[PDB]
Design a protein around this motif. Structure first.
Motif, mmCIF file in Angstrom:
data_model
loop_
_atom_site.group_PDB
_atom_site.id
_atom_site.type_symbol
_atom_site.label_atom_id
_atom_site.label_comp_id
_atom_site.label_asym_id
_atom_site.label_seq_id
_atom_site.Cartn_x
_atom_site.Cartn_y
_atom_site.Cartn_z
ATOM 1 N N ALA A 1 -0.568 -0.367 -15.183
ATOM 2 C CA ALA A 1 -0.087 0.568 -14.179
ATOM 3 C C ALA A 1 0.787 -0.156 -13.157
ATOM 4 O O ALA A 1 1.103 -1.338 -13.356
ATOM 5 C CB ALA A 1 -1.312 1.224 -13.528
ATOM 6 N N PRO A 2 1.291 0.526 -12.099
ATOM 7 C CA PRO A 2 1.592 -0.204 -10.863
ATOM 8 C C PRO A 2 0.451 -1.120 -10.472
ATOM 9 O O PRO A 2 -0.698 -0.686 -10.382
ATOM 10 C CB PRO A 2 1.808 0.916 -9.846
ATOM 11 N N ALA A 3 0.752 -2.403 -10.318
ATOM 12 C CA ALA A 3 -0.267 -3.433 -10.290
ATOM 13 C C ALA A 3 0.059 -4.463 -9.224
ATOM 14 O O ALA A 3 1.198 -4.590 -8.772
ATOM 15 C CB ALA A 3 -0.396 -4.113 -11.655
ATOM 16 N N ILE A 4 -0.970 -5.199 -8.824
ATOM 17 C CA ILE A 4 -0.864 -6.187 -7.765
ATOM 18 C C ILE A 4 -1.337 -7.523 -8.308
ATOM 19 O O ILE A 4 -2.430 -7.618 -8.876
ATOM 20 C CB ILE A 4 -1.696 -5.783 -6.537
ATOM 21 N N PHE B 1 2.193 -11.733 -16.566
ATOM 22 C CA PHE B 1 3.224 -10.746 -16.280
ATOM 23 C C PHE B 1 3.394 -9.731 -17.395
ATOM 24 O O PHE B 1 3.878 -8.625 -17.138
ATOM 25 C CB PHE B 1 4.549 -11.437 -15.998
ATOM 26 N N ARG B 2 3.015 -10.070 -18.624
ATOM 27 C CA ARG B 2 2.957 -9.033 -19.645
ATOM 28 C C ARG B 2 1.804 -8.087 -19.378
ATOM 29 O O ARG B 2 1.941 -6.873 -19.554
ATOM 30 C CB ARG B 2 2.832 -9.643 -21.037
ATOM 31 N N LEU B 3 0.669 -8.625 -18.930
ATOM 32 C CA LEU B 3 -0.502 -7.800 -18.664
ATOM 33 C C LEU B 3 -0.272 -6.851 -17.504
ATOM 34 O O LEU B 3 -0.775 -5.724 -17.517
ATOM 35 C CB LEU B 3 -1.703 -8.696 -18.388
ATOM 36 N N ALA B 4 0.507 -7.269 -16.514
ATOM 37 C CA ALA B 4 0.781 -6.385 -15.391
ATOM 38 C C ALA B 4 1.812 -5.336 -15.764
ATOM 39 O O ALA B 4 1.695 -4.173 -15.363
ATOM 40 C CB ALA B 4 1.253 -7.194 -14.191
ATOM 41 N N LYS B 5 2.831 -5.732 -16.527
ATOM 42 C CA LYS B 5 3.867 -4.796 -16.942
ATOM 43 C C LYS B 5 3.317 -3.765 -17.916
ATOM 44 O O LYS B 5 3.717 -2.596 -17.884
ATOM 45 C CB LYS B 5 5.035 -5.561 -17.558
ATOM 46 N N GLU B 6 2.384 -4.180 -18.772
ATOM 47 C CA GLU B 6 1.732 -3.241 -19.674
ATOM 48 C C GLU B 6 0.857 -2.256 -18.916
ATOM 49 O O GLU B 6 0.744 -1.094 -19.316
ATOM 50 C CB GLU B 6 0.907 -4.012 -20.705
ATOM 51 N N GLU C 1 0.821 -1.205 0.000
ATOM 52 C CA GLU C 1 0.000 0.000 0.000
ATOM 53 C C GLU C 1 0.856 1.258 0.000
ATOM 54 O O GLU C 1 0.645 2.165 -0.812
ATOM 55 C CB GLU C 1 -0.933 -0.019 1.207
ATOM 56 N N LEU C 2 1.824 1.323 0.895
ATOM 57 C CA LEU C 2 2.654 2.504 1.101
ATOM 58 C C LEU C 2 3.519 2.951 -0.083
ATOM 59 O O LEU C 2 3.486 4.150 -0.391
ATOM 60 C CB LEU C 2 3.532 2.296 2.335
ATOM 61 N N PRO C 3 4.290 2.090 -0.783
ATOM 62 C CA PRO C 3 5.169 2.627 -1.836
ATOM 63 C C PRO C 3 4.429 3.123 -3.051
ATOM 64 O O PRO C 3 5.033 3.801 -3.888
ATOM 65 C CB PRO C 3 6.060 1.435 -2.204
ATOM 66 N N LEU C 4 3.150 2.802 -3.181
ATOM 67 C CA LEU C 4 2.361 3.387 -4.246
ATOM 68 C C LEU C 4 2.083 4.859 -3.982
ATOM 69 O O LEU C 4 2.060 5.657 -4.924
ATOM 70 C CB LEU C 4 1.062 2.594 -4.405
ATOM 71 N N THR C 5 1.865 5.240 -2.728
ATOM 72 C CA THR C 5 1.515 6.627 -2.411
ATOM 73 C C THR C 5 2.759 7.420 -2.030
ATOM 74 O O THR C 5 3.114 8.397 -2.693
ATOM 75 C CB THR C 5 0.485 6.661 -1.284
#
Ligand SMILES: Nc1ncnc2c1ncn2[C@@H]1O[C@H](COP(=O)(O)OP(=O)(O)OP(=O)(O)O)[C@@H](O)[C@H]1O
Ligand SMILES: [Mg+2]
Ligand SMILES: [Zn+2]
Lengths: 101, 94, 53, 50, 209, 50, 287, 286, 48, 50
Positions: free
Chosen positions: E188-191, E181-186, E112-116
């Protein structure tokens, strides 16, 4: 029968076969049908066939069964809230079942 | 009577013309609003009645004459300042 | 005159196919033997109740 | 300062008889085209076992 | 006539386009594309598309008859289609969990924290942590905590269970790993939450099977 | 813009692979999903295309 | 006594009957007749077109119904005008225009009966955007095999209107039939009534679309125009001798400095002036 | 109950040529034919038509000829070649319409129950008039009035489907009233949008001239239906005042600082880029 | 050329597979007699 | 009753037949990405009120 809807019947022994990614595929489909018709009753006789317990090495057949189990174990309490759907599990054995089950 | 130039009628004019008392004019005008021969409103900090009115009737040919003169003043204001716009922007109209 | 009109537009040659399933909202989903699946909302010169998959 | 090829080798299995093999032949000719070349394998505990 | 030209260029693309994939670029304004009808082609391409979106590969839009390049699709616009947005999303909140005081904070540091407050890590120069493993006896709030992170996140969230990417055909499984992992890298910052992974986690020494 | 819009309005070219083919102004092309064709050249290129 | 570079006049009322009837039966290659007048040697005009009922055979000589022929001709004699048939047409959906092997036999039937009997091929599903793939043709003899087929002569309007296209010369062009030019008998009182009646708006010319979405759109452009101005800051304060005629050409992207600039300034100008000028007039006109 | 009719542009078009067909013998100044249609909803659709022999005499204006047998067979033809289409009514021209149209309509309502008629205007084609369509209802007339027919109006429009805009856009090719307009295009829309404002008003000028002057008998319906118009126009007030300059200024600010400044700086950028490239080719000629 | 699945009585209504294209319900042309069009036979088939 | 059946067939004769496909994703408010059962992918729209 009392205020019925789309009741299901699963013998839980026809859902295993040779190929590895199919026993999970049946379980995913039967829950997607249950989310389709919103009142629904799942019935699965003889859980002890695929219920079991996890252990060290069963190399050939047993790893498929445990992955089949973890799909069942975590799509009725998964990330999605299983809503308006009830499950009746019935087996004559159970001494050994998964404590997560 | 007055052609909406000052259609904010005072309550005393109703109490004079209808010769009704002051306390009954509100029930009187809410009645005519209820029936639907008028669509105005009521203020009471001034006790004056606003009038937006939609129930027309016969207007007695001698008052078609005054209706003609309203239409001609309306006519020449349309035509004149159309000519002012066309003559002003003639070079970019084409 | 209508029967003469249907006679002309009902003409050989025919494609064969297999009705996969049947719906009503009278409706049919048809895979041809060209391996192509089509839909039709209106069935035609048969009855829907007379048909089977 | 050379042509450098990254192959995380598990990407040559694809689905088909054939196709998973023929691109290996199609790999080294693509490395032969850029003739000074270095090809890299990730994690040969996959294909290449026994 | 200049406005007639821009209109006719504009209305060549609003049409039922067919979709192929970009294959190779010969030169300026002409390239090789292969359709998803099969039957690889060779057509002209436009002057509208910025050419830095055709790297070796992109799903592209093609006219029916003239068959030319028309538009470049957005990257991985489908692939595995896994975006949990707004029914479905969490049916839970952060304060609903009672008593995991250390553990709610520890997940919050990594996710949560490093996103903000990303600058706090940049101020110290940390490279904030990347992955997290949760383990315990069953029924102790693991899946529940993962639902609460998916409430109050502002990221693209993707749920995975550790069983549906081992399946029928040969090499089919690891391609689904590539799809995630392509879908996450394409995006935003993603979980990426992969639920129970001890299906594919046991260290193998050798398999004679 | 007119030169673009006219060349846009044009049925696109096929692609066929030739590793080798015979001489005498005609070559032998298999295209993508089909058989082989004895075709003719255009006159802006050579027979030395192989 | 031989052919020239002729001319075909089709009426405006013909062309709408052509590609509506083709668009109606889009899978099934519709069929119709062509009714005009052979006006001289080497011009021809057609004024009217009526369709044909469709048979199970398709486009051939059998789909020409002689009892539908003479009855349709009879009831056009007393109403409108009677004239001679001058040809025929059909629709080829899957491809542009060329006479097929069944098309060439029914052309033989009409050219034996009539003078020349020009055929017309119309592709409705290709004719979409702003151009129409319509073409007209005429069957050439084999007796002139030792002479010039397409016997054309003293004019310089043959190299216009089309070069013989590659998808059409692969078929019987230019040794079975020849192409022929088409222009339109286009006139006033039909041009203006189709202009002014299809695109017109009278009371819309002084409406308002008032302000809840107009002034909202005045926010909708300015915001990215701010950021695009900051991008305009970036390139101008850059200004490095990186061979600046090469630096400008290696980063064409339909992008910042002038392209993605004042285009927005135009749209902000045109929207607000036409809004505010129509607002001041309604105060002027209405009391 | 008809919302509006949709005029496909082949029908009018196929009226004008038929007026031109009889125009070589033209002494009738009216053309009556059959209007095919396709009734879908409360909105109506027309896409095809044809004509029929018709005559009319100026004396007694009640001897007239629709041809039933010609209407039977040729509609039987158009049914056979296209079973989608059926009749919906009829048409004529000559905008000063003959009063015989009660008799024409009440005959061929036995072909279509809710029959409808459209007047096209072949020669008057100038100011604001595409067509006009009527609907037929019959009350008595009013509460305490004798019997009457009273044609009523349904609004009209000109429709457009695909593969006729293809025929339209290929036939204009001259000015076309080009796509989404510039400054000059919108101002002309305000000009001839306003040139028809007084044109409708000069017609309602002449009506209450010649009815109030004292020639023709007064309607009562149109009088008070005109009255509420004059008691509905807005006036100027303080609430109109402070509001208008509140949002004229707000429209103005977008023009002033954001459009005039930035367009100037772009043209100012073209100064320096020209003058550098001018003299650096000048000083480096020799 | 194709093969024939079967036939019908008093009227052809023949069933024929290209089997590489689809299977078709077709007719015979006028140049033949309906006798020697027996089942499982190679026949000459029109393109259209 | 027999004429009712004939007019039903005159209605039945004019239908076109449709293509079966499935939606892959949605791009914009009118642009979709669908895919046929055996064929390629496409970009489509709605009718009016779907
Ligand atoms: N601290 C807590 N506060 C409220 N509810 C709790 C708490 N801990 C557990 N629960 C309840 O226990 C149930 C199981 O939660 P969860 O699925 O997260 O446990 P789990 O450890 O993930 O189980 P498994 O590991 O078998 O998936 C939840 O539905 C929740 O209602
Ligand atoms: Mg869990
Ligand atoms: Zn043909």
């Amino acid at each position: 029968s009392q205020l019925d809807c789309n009741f299901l019947k699963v013998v839980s022994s026809s859902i295993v076969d040779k190929y590895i990614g199919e026993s999970a595929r049946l379980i995913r489909e039967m829950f997607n049908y249950a989310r389709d018709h919103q009142p629904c009753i799942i019935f699965m006789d003889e859980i002890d066939a695929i219920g079991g317990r996890r252990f060290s090495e069963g190399t050939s057949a047993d790893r498929e069964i445990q992955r089949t189990l973890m799909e069942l174990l975590n799509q009725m309490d998964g990330f999605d809230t299983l809503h308006r759907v009830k499950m009746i599990m019935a087996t004559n054995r159970p001494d050994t079942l998964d404590p997560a089950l | 009577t007055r052609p909406a130039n000052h259609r904010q009628l005072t309550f005393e004019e109703i109490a004079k013309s209808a010769k009704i008392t002051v306390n009954e004019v509100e029930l009187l005008v809410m009645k005519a609003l209820s029936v639907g021969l008028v669509k105005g409103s009521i203020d009471e900090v001034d006790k004056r009645v606003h009038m937006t009115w939609v129930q027309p009737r016969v207007l007695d040919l001698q008052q078609i004459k005054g209706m003609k003169d309203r239409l001609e003043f309306w006519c020449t204001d349309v035509k004149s300042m159309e000519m002012l716009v066309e003559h002003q922007a003639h070079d970019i109209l084409t | 005159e209508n029967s003469e009109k249907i006679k002309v537009n009902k003409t050989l040659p025919y494609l064969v196919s297999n009705v996969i399933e049947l719906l009503d909202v009278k409706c049919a989903v048809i895979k041809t033997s060209t391996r192509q699946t089509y839909f039709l909302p209106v069935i035609g010169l048969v009855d829907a109740e007379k048909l089977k998959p | 300062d050379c042509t450098f090829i990254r192959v995380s080798g598990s990407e040559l299995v694809q689905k088909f008889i054939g196709e998973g093999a023929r691109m290996v032949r199609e790999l080294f000719v693509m490395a032969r085209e850029h003739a000074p070349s270095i090809i890299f394998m990730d994690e040969i505990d996959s294909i290449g076992s026994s | 006539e200049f406005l007639h030209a821009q209109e006719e260029v504009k209305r060549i693309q609003s049409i039922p386009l067919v979709i192929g994939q970009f294959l190779e670029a010969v030169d300026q304004n002409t390239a090789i594309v292969g359709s998803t009808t099969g039957s690889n082609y060779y057509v002209r391409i436009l002057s509208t598309i910025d050419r830095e979106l055709l790297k070796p590969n992109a799903s592209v839009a093609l006219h029916k008859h003239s068959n030319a390049l028309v538009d470049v699709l957005p990257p991985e616009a489908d692939s595995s289609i896994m975006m949990l947005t707004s029914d479905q999303k969490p049916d839970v909140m952060y304060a609903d969990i009672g008593g995991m005081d250390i553990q709610k904070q520890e997940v919050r540091e990594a996710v949560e924290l490093p996103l903000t407050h990303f600058e706090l890590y940049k101020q110290i120069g940390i490279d904030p942590p990347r992955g997290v493993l949760m383990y315990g006896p069953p029924g102790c709030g693991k899946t529940m905590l993962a639902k609460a992170v998916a409430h109050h996140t502002t990221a693209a969230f993707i749920r995975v269970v550790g069983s549906e990417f081992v399946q029928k055909y040969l090499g089919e499984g690891p391609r689904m790993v590539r799809d995630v992992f392509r879908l996450a890298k394409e995006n935003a910052p993603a979980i990426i939450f992969i639920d129970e992974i001890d299906a594919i986690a046991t260290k193998r020494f050798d398999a004679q099977t | 813009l007119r030169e673009e819009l006219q060349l846009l309005q044009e049925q696109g070219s096929y692609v066929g692979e030739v590793v080798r083919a015979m001489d005498k102004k005609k070559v032998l092309v298999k295209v993508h999903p089909e058989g082989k064709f004895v075709v003719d050249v255009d006159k802006n290129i050579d027979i030395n295309d192989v | 006594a031989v052919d020239t570079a002729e001319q075909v006049y089709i009426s405006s009322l013909a062309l709408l009957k052509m590609l509506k009837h083709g668009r109606a039966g889009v899978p099934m290659e519709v069929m119709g007749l062509m009714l005009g007048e052979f006006v001289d040697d080497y011009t021809v005009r057609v004024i009217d077109v009526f369709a044909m009922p469709q048979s199970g055979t398709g486009v051939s000589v059998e789909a020409v119904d002689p009892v539908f022929q003479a009855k349709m001709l009879d009831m056009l004699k007393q109403t409108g005008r009677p004239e001679m048939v001058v040809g025929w047409y059909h629709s080829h959906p899957g491809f542009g225009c060329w006479l097929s092997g069944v098309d060439i036999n029914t052309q033989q039937s009409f050219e034996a009966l009539s003078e020349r009997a020009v055929a017309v091929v119309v592709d409705p599903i290709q004719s979409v955007k702003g151009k129409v793939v319509i073409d007209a043709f005429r069957l050439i003899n084999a007796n002139m095999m030792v002479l010039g087929h397409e016997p054309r002569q003293t004019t310089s309007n043959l190299g216009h209107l089309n070069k013989p296209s590659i998808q059409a010369l692969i078929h019987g062009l230019n040794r079975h039939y020849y192409s022929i030019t088409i222009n339109y008998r286009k006139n006033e009182l039909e041009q203006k009534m189709l202009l002014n009646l299809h695109k017109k708006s009278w009371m819309e010319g002084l409406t308002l679309q008032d302000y809840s979405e107009h002034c909202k759109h005045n926010e909708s452009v300015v915001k990215e125009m701010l950021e695009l101005a900051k991008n305009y800051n970036k390139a101008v304060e850059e200004e490095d001798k990186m061979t600046p005629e090469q630096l400008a050409i290696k980063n064409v992207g339909k992008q910042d400095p002038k392209r993605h600039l004042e285009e927005h300034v135009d749209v902000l100008m045109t929207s607000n002036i036409v809004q505010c000028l129509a607002a001041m007039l309604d105060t002027v006109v209405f009391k | 109950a008809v919302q509006k009719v949709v005029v496909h542009p082949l029908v009018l078009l196929s009226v004008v040529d038929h007026f031109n067909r009889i125009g070589k013998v033209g002494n009738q100044k009216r053309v009556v034919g059959v209007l095919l249609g396709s009734w879908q909803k409360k909105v109506l659709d027309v896409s095809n038509s044809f004509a029929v022999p018709f005559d009319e005499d100026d004396k007694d204006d009640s001897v007239w000829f629709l041809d039933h047998d010609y209407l039977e067979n040729m509609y039987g033809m158009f049914k056979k070649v296209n079973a989608r289409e059926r009749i919906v009514g009829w048409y004529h021209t000559g905008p000063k319409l003959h009063k015989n149209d009660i008799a024409i309509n009440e005959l061929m309502k036995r072909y279509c129950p809710n029959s409808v008629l459209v007047i096209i205007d072949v020669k008057p084609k100038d100011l604001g008039l595409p067509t006009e369509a009527y609907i037929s209802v019959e009350e008595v007339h009013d509460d305490g009035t004798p019997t009457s027919k009273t044609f009523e109006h349904v609004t009209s429009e000109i429709g457009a489907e695909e593969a006729e805009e293809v025929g339209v856009e290929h036939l204009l090719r001259d000015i076309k009233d080009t796509t989404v307009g510039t400054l000059s295009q919108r101002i002309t829309n305000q000009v001839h949008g306003l040139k028809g404002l007084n044109s409708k008003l000069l017609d309602i000028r002449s009506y209450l001239e010649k009815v109030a002057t004292g020639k023709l008998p007064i309607n009562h319906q149109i009088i008070y239906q005109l009255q509420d118009v004059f008691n509905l126009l807005p006036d100027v007030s303080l609430q109109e005042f402070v509001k208008a300059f509140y949002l004229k200024t707000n429209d103005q600010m977008v023009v002033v600082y954001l459009a005039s400044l930035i367009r100037s700086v772009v043209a100012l950028h073209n100064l320096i880029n020209n003058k550098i490239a001018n003299r650096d080719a000048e000083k480096k000629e020799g | 050329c194709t093969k024939i699945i079967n036939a019908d009585s008093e009227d052809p209504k023949y069933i024929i597979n290209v089997k590489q294209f689809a299977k078709f319900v077709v007719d015979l042309s006028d140049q033949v007699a309906p006798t020697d069009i027996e089942e499982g036979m190679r026949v000459g088939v029109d393109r259209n | 009753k027999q004429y009712e059946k004939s007019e039903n067939d005159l209605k039945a004769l004019q239908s076109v037949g449709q293509i079966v496909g499935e939606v892959l994703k949605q791009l914009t408010e009118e642009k979709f990405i669908v895919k046929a059962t055996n064929g390629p992918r496409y970009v489509v729209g709605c009718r009016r009120q779907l």
